[model samples]
Target: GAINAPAVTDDYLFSKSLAQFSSIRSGSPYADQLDWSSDGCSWSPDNPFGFKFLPACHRHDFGYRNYKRQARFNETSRLRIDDNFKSDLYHQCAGNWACNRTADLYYEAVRKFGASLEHH
Candidate 1:
């Protein structure tokens, strides 16, 4: 086998990320949306407790700078968020850099507020 990649652990990412994702800031666009629902929430990125996952489109309406414009969505309504929304934003003018900086914020939020007892 070629150079076997060292086992990638959460610790590695945490350290590389400088523990940022674990310490979410309140004013951060990401953090502002999250709620303190000890009754729900989980380590999994997907929904826990069966709360319907409202794609960011449905949650925020269509577009950012031009919220007035109807969201150009497929009939499936299955928005390709990471691709269509995050990367190739509908309009470059309305893009948000928050995603680029949110890795640490997410880690922080999960560490501090996630449902896991091991978060600390």
Candidate 2:
């Protein structure tokens, strides 16, 4: 276990990543077409139960918006991205059962609520 002292808890810290495994380096050529935006997990806790779930949700947002820009987003795309979100939450596991519960909540949430790409 590593450490980041601040009102800290015993959660493991992994570096930032995304729900979409395939990626283009941001700010690079061909990346400018995508609009990358996030609402910091959007109405959910960024680090619910002391896990780094925000990065998961943030990347989910990135995946959704950019793919929509590519005209590649649909119901299938939504669930796949959400499954990735589930994978992501598991990756951040530890602060344990509570974390998984939160993960289920998040995955369930996006599956239901992610019908449209725009949050507004």
Provide TM-scores for the models. Answer: 0.17, 0.67
Worst 10 residues of 2 by lDDT: 5-14
lDDT of 1 by residue, 1-120 (tens): 222212221122223221232232112322222321222223325422123212222222212211112233242222222233222222222334543343333334433433232243
Worst ten-residue run, lDDT, model 1?
59-68
lDDT of each: 0.27, 0.60
Candidate 2: what lDDT? Answer: 0.60
Give me the displacement of residue 61 in model 2, in angstroms.
Answer: 0.3
For all the candidates, what are their Cα RMSDs to the real structure? 19.4, 11.4
- Tens digit per residue, CA lDDT, model 2, 1-120: 132321111011122344332243243323334444567565675554533776676567766766666577788867777887788888777448878988898888788888753564
Error of 1 at 17 (Å): 14
Model 1, residue 41: C-alpha shift (Å): 8.8
Q: Which stretches of candidate 1 lie over 4 Å from their true place?
A: 1-96, 114-120
